[PDB]
Amino acid sequence: MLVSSNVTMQFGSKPLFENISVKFGGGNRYGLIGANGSGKSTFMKILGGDLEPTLGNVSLDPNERIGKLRQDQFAFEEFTVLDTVIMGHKELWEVKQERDRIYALPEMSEEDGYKVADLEVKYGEMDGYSAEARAGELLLGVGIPVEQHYGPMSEVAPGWKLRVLLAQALFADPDILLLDQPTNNLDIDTIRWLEQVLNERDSTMIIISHDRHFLNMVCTHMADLDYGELRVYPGNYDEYMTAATQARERLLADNAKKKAQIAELQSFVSRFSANASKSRQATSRARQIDKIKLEEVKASSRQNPFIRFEQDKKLFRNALEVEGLTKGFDNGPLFKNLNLLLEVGEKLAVLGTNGVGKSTLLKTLVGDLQPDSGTVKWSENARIGYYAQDHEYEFENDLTVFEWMSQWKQEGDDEQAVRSILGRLLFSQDDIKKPAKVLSGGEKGRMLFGKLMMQKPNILIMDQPTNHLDMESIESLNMALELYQGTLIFVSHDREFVSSLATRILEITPERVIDFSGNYEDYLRSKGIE
RNA sequence: CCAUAGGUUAAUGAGGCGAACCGGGGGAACUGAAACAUCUAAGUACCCCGAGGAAAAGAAAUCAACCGAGAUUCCCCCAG
RNA sequence: UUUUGUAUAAUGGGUCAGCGACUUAUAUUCUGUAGCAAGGUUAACCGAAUAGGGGAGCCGAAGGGAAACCGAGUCUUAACU
RNA sequence: AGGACCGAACCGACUAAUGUUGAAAAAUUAGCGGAUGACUUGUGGCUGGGGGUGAAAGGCCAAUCAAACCGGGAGAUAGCUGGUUCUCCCCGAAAGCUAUUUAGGUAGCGCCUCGUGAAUUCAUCUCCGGGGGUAGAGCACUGUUUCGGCAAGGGGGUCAUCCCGACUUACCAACCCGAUGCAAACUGCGAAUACCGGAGAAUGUUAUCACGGGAGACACACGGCGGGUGCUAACGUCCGUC
RNA sequence: GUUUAUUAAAAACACAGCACUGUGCAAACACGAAAGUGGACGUAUACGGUGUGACGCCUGCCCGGUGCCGGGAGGUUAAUUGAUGGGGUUAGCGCAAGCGAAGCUCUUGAUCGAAGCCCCGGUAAACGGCGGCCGUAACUAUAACGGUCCUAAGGUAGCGA
RNA sequence: UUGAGCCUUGAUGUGUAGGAUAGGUGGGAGGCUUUGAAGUGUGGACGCCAGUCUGCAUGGAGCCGACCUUGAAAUACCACCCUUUAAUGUUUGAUGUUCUAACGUUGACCCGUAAUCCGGGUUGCGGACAGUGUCUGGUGGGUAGUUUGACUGGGGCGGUCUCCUCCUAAAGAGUAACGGAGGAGCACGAAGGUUGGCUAAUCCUGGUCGGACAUCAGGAGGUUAGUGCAAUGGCAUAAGCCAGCUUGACUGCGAGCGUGACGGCGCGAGCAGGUGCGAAAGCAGGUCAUAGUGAUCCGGUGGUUCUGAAUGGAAGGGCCAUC
RNA sequence: UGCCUGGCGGCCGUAGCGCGGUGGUCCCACCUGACCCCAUGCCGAACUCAGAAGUGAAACGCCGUAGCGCCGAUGGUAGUGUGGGGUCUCCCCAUGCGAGAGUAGGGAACUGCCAGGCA
RNA sequence: CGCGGGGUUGAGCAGCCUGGUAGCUCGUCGGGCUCAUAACCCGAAGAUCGUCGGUUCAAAUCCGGCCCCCGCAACCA
RNA sequence: AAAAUGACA
Ligand SMILES: Nc1ncnc2c1ncn2[C@@H]1O[C@H](COP(=O)(O)OP(=O)(O)OP(=O)(O)O)[C@@H](O)[C@H]1O
Ligand SMILES: Nc1ncnc2c1ncn2[C@@H]1O[C@H](COP(=O)(O)OP(=O)(O)OP(=O)(O)O)[C@@H](O)[C@H]1O
Ligand SMILES: [Mg+2]
Ligand SMILES: [Mg+2]
Ligand SMILES: [Mg+2]
Ligand SMILES: [Mg+2]
Ligand SMILES: [Mg+2]
Ligand SMILES: [Mg+2]
Ligand SMILES: [Mg+2]
Ligand SMILES: [Mg+2]
Ligand SMILES: [Mg+2]
Ligand SMILES: [Mg+2]
Ligand SMILES: [Mg+2]
Ligand SMILES: [Mg+2]
Ligand SMILES: [Mg+2]
Ligand SMILES: [Mg+2]
Ligand SMILES: [Mg+2]
Ligand SMILES: [Mg+2]
Ligand SMILES: [Mg+2]
Ligand SMILES: [Mg+2]
Ligand SMILES: [Mg+2]
Ligand SMILES: [Mg+2]
Ligand SMILES: [Mg+2]
Ligand SMILES: [Mg+2]
Ligand SMILES: [Mg+2]
Ligand SMILES: [Mg+2]
Ligand SMILES: [Mg+2]
Ligand SMILES: [Mg+2]
Ligand SMILES: [Mg+2]
Ligand SMILES: [Mg+2]
Ligand SMILES: [Mg+2]
Ligand SMILES: [Mg+2]
Ligand SMILES: [Mg+2]
Ligand SMILES: [Mg+2]
Ligand SMILES: [Mg+2]
Ligand SMILES: [Mg+2]
Ligand SMILES: [Mg+2]
Ligand SMILES: [Mg+2]
Ligand SMILES: [Mg+2]
Ligand SMILES: [Mg+2]
Ligand SMILES: [Mg+2]
Ligand SMILES: [Mg+2]
Ligand SMILES: [Mg+2]
Ligand SMILES: [Mg+2]
Ligand SMILES: [Mg+2]
Ligand SMILES: [Mg+2]
Ligand SMILES: [Mg+2]
Ligand SMILES: [Mg+2]
Ligand SMILES: [Mg+2]
Ligand code: NA
Ligand code: NA
């Protein structure tokens, strides 16, 4: 079973995590939780050996095939989907490709023949004969068609190849699964399939997830990464959240009721110390006061960012109008004969879930995706704040966080007012010196929220604004957008964030759009969903 | 019911005292540590039991070092 | 006697006579003296025995290093002018 | 009838005097409270030491009680007090520094003494080579101070009190200039002494240094000079040197 | 009535009366290393512990703290049990390095595990506690009155230099 | 009744592309059915719901591998097994009801006995509970041993206790007071090394917002500025300010000194081995210097044939680096 | 050898500032150009290169001047080692040492080694 | 002046709790309901966070001085 | 459901 001892990673002048030593193993599944920027991804990198710790150890058995997940790479793109999911087995992939190379190079001499016979028997023991079949029976579960199973990695879509990268990790029942945010930008049906296929396995799995309904579904232990110490509570999710609460409140109460007695042994020392017949008794109360040592409270890293979008110039009457916006890439009718008029104050939630033009509507509205036919007439003064689903291009350039946030300073504000946004977004003194490239996913979504806030738009378009954000962030931004007085266009899958704030639903089905004029609860009752 | 428990008679032995030495059952504290609790004083003082002219121990399931010695007890070194 | 300092009004003693306080054992070191002198000396014990025997053993003539080890050298160091 | 009333025996002990080496290691004299009751008394018995008994005071347990008396461990320990016994000859201190559960104890060093071994070793004076920053002094610097000159600028009165300031100002006033002082924590100056080193005589029973045996002492006092504190008070208190 | 025999005889102690609490009998409680004794040759109208101290009128509010009583769902938790992992040794395969069966060993400690504590409620003739600031009435004065903060609750009847 | 282990028996473990809900080995492929059928007449359970397993029979005597699409073949079947399992057995557990036989009886009767002790015998009632022993968690002033600092203008309170800078400090060093004043318990991968260059404060005159004070251009001034941090001493050859390259913020040593009662602390040319900057002479063993810190014991981690209690190993010690 | 000039020193204001004058054959400075060898947080202003029309304006060197800076006696004063004295918070006497400020005054340097030109 | 607790709109108080948001209950002011007042409903007003300085991009918060108010304390033989 | 008050003459 995997063990870690005193990992202690540190880049800067503040503790990140200290003397982490924990045994992971035994078939238990450890949901690893924390704040949006504490330690989780750089800890599953350490557990897999991607970066060695500053000073520490990670111990694994001589043969224990780590099945870990991507989302630190996107561009393998040299071979077919079948042989892309195959190479999750780093052992079998090498023997397979090496024997193919040997077959390519002439001839099978005695060095070549004896080099190849044992590799062939190794392949047989590893059952590579039925490797592609078992890979395909998993690609079908993920949702990739049989007729294009054998297509190269350029045939696949950019939003469809993360599916294959997910399928790679859990290929052939590998013990110890390092899953790093697997359910992000996935649908309800795929999430249900994944949480069903992980429920039939005896393999320790350490999973990062910022949602509650998946951790509370699959996980057994609830390893935390807050305060610095990795506190592991054996609990589902709710018996962790109801245990840490009283664990912290007991500490607070003990400090209160132990300071309240120092304040009582102090009223005697302050009154009878100078006396002669009572100084002996007043200088033993001082010993009692000094021998108390109330224990310290360190604030949790969770916190709650203060986000609020305002609007510089409110605009009246219609804010948008879309007239005959038929468009499709290679399936033709991505959305057929769209026709709509968006008023002011609308909170339009565009639903519909998977591969259909759930996005590319927002891309056409902003204009970066030219439509096939139609014209989109924004309001006269319409200023659009765009939060793209894939926002890497704005951080590939490596500026300091301060300069990156200062790019968008407007006419009438200082770099005193620039740093206030970062302060409200919880970038304190060193995390404003990091390169913009090296930041967490949630710490990056927040940094885009602080650019929208800084620009102060009157039309907000947001492609999945609930990505890599913990409960605190999707509770702050939810009310930040609720208080918003303006036009909002957003898309999300979780049936809570969209239901909290929406006055109109426009969801597209791969044959025809359907529009509504009420909130999501009425939408479901009219659909026939209980 | 047999039988045991119990009763009577007879034969033999013991009982108490004594200075030290000896074997065993229990077992302090002052004191030293420049305070004190681990530790020392010390298995000492003292209490109790038992025997002897002495008592205990004693004839390797011991040491040694692959060379060997040969029960126990006491004295001088090893050795502060 | 104790004190920086007592005629001190600081302590002790009424006087006489007798008793009353740096000792003994074993180890170690330095001085003096005596014997022997790269040698010196025995302990227990035997012994008609303060003689003689007994040299088990102790101290000294070689040191350096934590140690193996080397040895008028040795340790340090990869090596030391 | 009565934990009833007055009052002797009987039990007790509120006040005063005497007595304090007493008649007595708690009493006598004149008064005083209870006196059929939770009373008082004779004889015998039981409870024993961290234990007894206690209408409760730490009271009583053989003139002894916040832990009896006797014997033993025992000659407990005492950084504290006292005492320490015959004679002569030579040398002869310290009451300081450092450390201390340390401050009236002790350890190392400084000072004393005995032995051994060594070089003009050491001391005084004359001459030569040195570094000061004290006394004194000075006011360029750091502060402080009083005058006089020029006065930036600043407060006050009149008028459109939008401006510009159109004015004024008996009043304040920095920086510079000339004159006059003060400073432990000021110095563009600067002694006497003292101290370090070298050379030279004369003088001094090696007075110098090293090693080894034995210590004592680490409570100081006053007087002159230089000073901190105090009141330039104290036979006050804390340092330097004699 | 008792008390410091021998400097204190009192307002101190005891008391009848009152209340709380323990005790179902081989009672609780005490003296005992234990046997056994007192309680008691008694049986809840009896016995022990604690406080108050005839009698008359009465004995207010607070369960946050500390005790005591009841509750057991949940968390933590000893001995006991010893699943796993790591190391030592070595029959052998290799005369290279090196691995290394069985056994014996050193260590690590999964699982089981009660009371207590955390938690929930009660109890004050259980130990105990019982508030600040500001304004306001026909002359002055004072506030019956009002605002607010805090507390577990803010000292009631009676008495008061 | 309910946990857990084990054994025996039977099921369940399609997505394609297949006749059809095939688990992997491979034995065979011609074998399964008449001690009485594929279908039928009819039960229940399971499910990706398409389909599988089972009682018996009026009748019943016949179904599949050969083909075929797959990486792979078939309830023709048996085998040794794997996952989820269902049932009966068997092992210890937990719980609850009964029982008597250990154990209790300070219930009744008889005897030793002329005995409200004790013992034995019948009987009744409790009954594997209570109680006792070893180990163990809680409570435990009921009891016992003890600790509860020093300086100090008497003691107590207040203040202080180690390190750095100035004055007292009497022109070498040192020098006290509960004397007068301030600081430290770090920081910096550049604020370290080298090479190349550069020189400040403060006013005086001319200009957009622009002002007494911002940037510009002249002149006076002279280090009155600056130094990561308190003060003192320094600093122009700059130790102050920029830039290029770099890691000497190296290893073993070290003549000779300074300062301490010691433990110790500090300065150091030069030597050897390997570097950096510079063309080169050369400079670099952290920073302008002085604060930024605690012995020993005990223990942890890494290296090293030094030792290894018969011998070969090992534990354990030692040494080096470090916590 | 005499004069001028350049480099390296000695010495460090009696040596430095201010005012006036003067020097271009050589030397020195300014000077022309800049693609390139090099360089500017922009600018050949600085650093650097190829040359040489002009000038001695500025800088530099030399000479003259006291308006500053600077040096500075003699005498007296203060202080002080040793020995004495007083009316002793401070002084005095014998003896030895003897400033600081100020005054008279001095004063716009002196000098070595090479290398060029005019002699 | 030795030690604590404070100074936040007119009154009484949070926010200091590890600097990025100035808030509560009552009150004042202007409307509405009412015959009229009170209550009630709506809208707004106002604080140099006692006053000075310091690192700080940013102070009420962190540090120090000064002033004011409330409690103490300044011992025994 | 909440609804208090109105000097004398
Ligand atoms: N190179 C880097 N330099 C500085 N900080 C870094 C660097 N790489 C990562 N970090 C920091 O490490 C942390 C990583 O946070 P982490 O990835 O666990 O966040 P998350 O959003 O919770 O994770 P996840 O993406 O897995 O859901 C962040 O605080 C990030 O700033
Ligand atoms: N850049 C592109 N180049 C080519 N085809 C594209 C591109 N972007 C999208 N597509 C095609 O258009 C389709 C629409 O994708 P779209 O972004 O609308 O999906 P989605 O519902 O937002 O996906 P998801 O939730 O997985 O991110 C894609 O599935 C793909 O086939
Ligand atoms: Mg006998
Ligand atoms: Mg002792
Ligand atoms: Mg002692
Ligand atoms: Mg015998
Ligand atoms: Mg004396
Ligand atoms: Mg005296
Ligand atoms: Mg005399
Ligand atoms: Mg006398
Ligand atoms: Mg005396
Ligand atoms: Mg006398
Ligand atoms: Mg006599
Ligand atoms: Mg005698
Ligand atoms: Mg030797
Ligand atoms: Mg009577
Ligand atoms: Mg009477
Ligand atoms: Mg009477
Ligand atoms: Mg009496
Ligand atoms: Mg009396
Ligand atoms: Mg009488
Ligand atoms: Mg008595
Ligand atoms: Mg006692
Ligand atoms: Mg003794
Ligand atoms: Mg004695
Ligand atoms: Mg003499
Ligand atoms: Mg003493
Ligand atoms: Mg002076
Ligand atoms: Mg002393
Ligand atoms: Mg002394
Ligand atoms: Mg003295
Ligand atoms: Mg004196
Ligand atoms: Mg009395
Ligand atoms: Mg009472
Ligand atoms: Mg009451
Ligand atoms: Mg009884
Ligand atoms: Mg006690
Ligand atoms: Mg003792
Ligand atoms: Mg004291
Ligand atoms: Mg000095
Ligand atoms: Mg001196
Ligand atoms: Mg001295
Ligand atoms: Mg530096
Ligand atoms: Mg340089
Ligand atoms: Mg430097
Ligand atoms: Mg420094
Ligand atoms: Mg061995
Ligand atoms: Mg052995
Ligand atoms: Mg070892
Ligand atoms: Na990440
Ligand atoms: Na998308």
Coordinates of C-alpha atoms in Angstrom, one line a residue, chain A residues 348-501:
Chain A
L348 CA -30.6 33.3 -19.8
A349 CA -29.4 29.8 -19.0
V350 CA -28.6 27.8 -22.1
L351 CA -28.9 24.1 -21.4
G352 CA -28.6 20.9 -23.3
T353 CA -25.9 18.4 -22.8
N354 CA -23.4 16.9 -24.9
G355 CA -21.3 17.8 -28.0
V356 CA -24.3 19.8 -29.3
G357 CA -23.8 23.5 -29.7
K358 CA -24.2 24.1 -26.0
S359 CA -21.3 26.4 -26.5
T360 CA -20.5 28.0 -30.0
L361 CA -23.7 29.9 -29.4
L362 CA -21.7 32.1 -26.9
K363 CA -18.8 32.1 -29.4
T364 CA -21.1 33.3 -32.2
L365 CA -22.6 35.9 -29.9
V366 CA -19.2 37.3 -29.1
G367 CA -18.3 36.9 -32.8
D368 CA -15.2 34.7 -32.6
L369 CA -17.2 31.9 -34.3
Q370 CA -18.7 33.3 -37.5
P371 CA -22.2 32.0 -38.2
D372 CA -23.3 30.2 -41.3
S373 CA -26.3 32.5 -41.9
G374 CA -27.7 35.3 -39.8
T375 CA -26.9 38.5 -38.1
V376 CA -26.4 39.3 -34.4
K377 CA -27.2 42.9 -33.4
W378 CA -25.9 43.8 -30.0
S379 CA -27.3 46.9 -28.3
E380 CA -25.7 50.2 -29.0
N381 CA -23.6 50.6 -25.8
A382 CA -23.5 46.9 -25.1
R383 CA -20.2 46.1 -23.3
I384 CA -19.6 42.3 -23.0
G385 CA -17.6 40.6 -20.4
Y386 CA -16.7 37.2 -21.7
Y387 CA -15.6 34.3 -19.4
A388 CA -14.6 31.5 -21.9
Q389 CA -14.8 27.9 -21.0
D390 CA -11.2 27.3 -22.1
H391 CA -9.2 30.3 -20.9
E392 CA -5.7 29.1 -21.3
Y393 CA -4.7 31.5 -24.0
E394 CA -4.9 34.5 -21.6
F395 CA -2.4 32.9 -19.3
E396 CA 0.0 31.3 -21.8
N397 CA 1.8 34.6 -21.6
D398 CA 3.7 34.6 -18.4
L399 CA 3.2 37.9 -16.5
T400 CA 3.3 38.5 -12.8
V401 CA -0.2 38.3 -11.3
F402 CA 0.0 42.0 -10.5
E403 CA 0.7 43.0 -14.1
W404 CA -1.9 40.6 -15.5
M405 CA -4.6 42.1 -13.3
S406 CA -3.2 45.6 -14.2
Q407 CA -3.6 45.1 -17.9
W408 CA -7.3 45.9 -17.6
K409 CA -7.2 48.9 -15.3
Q410 CA -9.7 51.5 -16.6
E411 CA -9.7 55.2 -16.8
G412 CA -10.0 56.5 -13.2
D413 CA -8.3 54.0 -11.0
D414 CA -4.9 53.4 -9.4
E415 CA -2.7 50.4 -8.8
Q416 CA -3.9 51.0 -5.3
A417 CA -7.4 50.1 -6.6
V418 CA -5.9 47.4 -8.8
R419 CA -4.6 45.5 -5.8
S420 CA -7.8 45.8 -3.9
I421 CA -9.5 43.4 -6.4
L422 CA -6.7 40.9 -5.8
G423 CA -7.0 41.4 -2.0
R424 CA -10.8 40.7 -2.2
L425 CA -9.9 37.7 -4.4
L426 CA -7.5 36.4 -1.7
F427 CA -4.1 37.0 -3.3
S428 CA -2.3 38.4 -0.3
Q429 CA 1.4 39.2 -0.6
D430 CA 3.4 36.3 -2.2
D431 CA 0.6 34.9 -4.5
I432 CA 0.7 38.2 -6.3
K433 CA 4.3 37.6 -7.3
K434 CA 3.8 34.2 -8.9
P435 CA 3.9 33.9 -12.7
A436 CA 0.4 34.0 -14.1
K437 CA 1.0 30.7 -15.8
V438 CA 1.5 28.7 -12.5
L439 CA -1.8 29.1 -10.8
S440 CA -4.6 26.7 -9.7
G441 CA -7.7 26.2 -11.7
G442 CA -10.0 27.9 -9.2
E443 CA -7.4 30.5 -8.5
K444 CA -7.5 31.2 -12.2
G445 CA -11.3 31.3 -12.5
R446 CA -11.3 33.8 -9.7
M447 CA -8.6 35.8 -11.5
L448 CA -10.9 36.0 -14.5
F449 CA -13.8 37.0 -12.3
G450 CA -11.6 39.8 -11.1
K451 CA -11.1 40.9 -14.6
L452 CA -14.8 40.9 -15.3
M453 CA -15.4 42.9 -12.1
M454 CA -12.6 45.3 -13.2
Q455 CA -14.0 45.9 -16.7
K456 CA -17.5 46.4 -15.3
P457 CA -19.6 45.1 -18.3
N458 CA -23.3 45.4 -18.8
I459 CA -23.7 42.1 -20.7
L460 CA -22.1 39.1 -19.0
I461 CA -21.5 35.9 -21.1
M462 CA -20.0 33.0 -19.1
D463 CA -19.3 29.6 -20.5
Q464 CA -19.5 27.3 -17.5
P465 CA -18.6 29.7 -14.7
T466 CA -18.6 26.9 -12.1
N467 CA -15.4 25.1 -13.1
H468 CA -12.7 24.3 -10.6
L469 CA -14.5 26.3 -8.0
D470 CA -15.2 25.0 -4.5
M471 CA -18.3 25.4 -2.4
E472 CA -17.2 28.8 -1.1
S473 CA -16.6 30.1 -4.6
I474 CA -19.8 28.8 -6.2
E475 CA -21.7 30.3 -3.2
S476 CA -20.0 33.7 -3.5
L477 CA -20.4 34.0 -7.3
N478 CA -23.9 32.7 -7.2
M479 CA -25.1 35.7 -5.1
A480 CA -22.7 38.0 -6.9
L481 CA -24.6 37.3 -10.1
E482 CA -27.9 37.3 -8.3
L483 CA -27.4 40.9 -7.2
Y484 CA -26.3 41.7 -10.8
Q485 CA -28.5 44.3 -12.5
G486 CA -28.0 43.6 -16.2
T487 CA -28.0 41.0 -19.0
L488 CA -26.5 37.6 -18.2
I489 CA -26.0 34.6 -20.5
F490 CA -24.6 31.5 -18.9
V491 CA -24.5 27.7 -19.2
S492 CA -24.0 25.0 -16.5
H493 CA -24.9 21.4 -15.8
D494 CA -25.5 21.3 -12.1
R495 CA -29.2 21.7 -11.5
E496 CA -28.7 24.1 -8.5
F497 CA -26.6 27.0 -9.8
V498 CA -28.7 27.4 -12.9
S499 CA -31.9 27.0 -10.8
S500 CA -30.9 29.7 -8.3
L501 CA -30.8 32.5 -10.8

